[PDB]
Amino acid sequence: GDQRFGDLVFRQLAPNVWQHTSYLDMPGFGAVASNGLIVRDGGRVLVVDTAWTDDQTAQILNWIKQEINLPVALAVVTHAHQDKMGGMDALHAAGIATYANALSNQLAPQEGMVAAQHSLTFAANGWVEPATAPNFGPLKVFYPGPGHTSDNITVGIDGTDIAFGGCLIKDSKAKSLGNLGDADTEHYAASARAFGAAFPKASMIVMSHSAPDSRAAITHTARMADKLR
């Protein structure tokens, strides 16, 4: 069951995997939820995405201290929007090593974000170049192509049935793709399908702006994105 912890919500998804949820009251758009992940890998914790703010991200770290009580070895953030990178300073203040797509780090300042410390680069086929993601343990990072943004990346969790689509994927009941302000409308559908093809065994799809769903999230997202072309 959901655990309310201050203004955030935490939900266990699998034995070593939790979803974090934070909210930003965006005037004209309501209070928008954003989800990321927390993964225990043996004696350390790995984080996918910040919360919207530094204060909220510090609260994620407080929850981790309370409920897991192991060091956070690293965080990876999945593009240069506030829901994913807004809390970078809190991660740095805590001494956590941070990683993002090279392109996300390049875009960060202009998007009003602080860059991660380290840049991921990607092979032509989309898989992260392993030397740029040292000590990622079960996190398998994949660049599916431009979609929600040019820089969006995705993360599978080895040893689980879970893959994280970030803001690229919406659930199977969604009426729209959400914020397309920085989207690549021509390539979105193919990128959504490439995410699915990269993690073919994942039966639980986690995403930023919907609750976890089946792979119907991927097919429905791609089918909606077909209409953008």
Distance between CA atoms of 116 and 76, rounded to whole angstroms?
Answer: 8
- Residue 140 annotated as part of some ligand binding site: no
* Three-state secondary structure string covering 147-203: CCCCCCCEEEECCCCEEECHHHCCCCCCCCCCCCCCCCCCCHHHHHHHHHHHCCCCC
Interface size with ligand [O-], residues (CB under 6 A): 4
Q: Which long-range contacts (CB under 8 A, 24 or more apart) does 157-161 make?
A: 157/14, 157/17, 157/37, 157/39, 159/16, 160/14, 160/16, 160/17, 160/204, 161/14, 161/201, 161/202, 161/203, 161/204
- 167 labeled part of a ligand binding site: yes
Closest distance to Zn ion from the beta carbon of 83 (Å) = 4
Q: Which is nearer to ligand [O-], 64 or 167 (CB)?
A: 167
- Bridge partner list, 23: 33
Check the annotation: does 79 bind a ligand.
yes
Binding-site member from 81, 170, 193, 220 for ligand [O-] (CB under 6 A):
81
Find the DSSP H helices in the chain: 54-67, 82-85, 88-93, 102-107, 188-198, 216-226
Query: Binding segment for Zn ion among 6-14, 81-89, 95-103, 132-140 (CB under 5 A)?
Result: 81-89
Among positions 204-223, residues that touch Zn ion (CB under 5 A) are 208
CB of 34 to ligand [O-], least distance (A): 7
Residue (21 or 208) nearer to Zn ion, CB = 208
| 83 touching Zn ion, by CB under 5 A | yes
Q: Nearest CA to 87 among 50, 124, 118?
A: 50
Nearer to ligand [O-], 45 or 80 (CB): 80
Q: Interface residues for ligand [O-] in 153-192 (CB under 6 A)?
A: 167, 179
Residue 35 in marked binding region: no
Q: Is 20 annotated as a binding residue?
A: no
- CA distances 206 to 58, 78, 82, 121, Å, are 22, 13, 18, 23
- By CB under 6 A, name the one of 49, 54, 83, 151 that touches ligand [O-]: 83
Show contacts with Zn ion in window 110-169 (CB under 5 A): 167
The answer to whether 220 is annotated as binding is no
Residues that bind ligand [O-] (CB under 6 A): 81, 83, 167, 179
Give the interface with Zn ion as residue ranges (CB under 5 A).
81, 83, 167, 208
Q: Cite the annotated binding site for substrate by residue number.
A: 170, 179
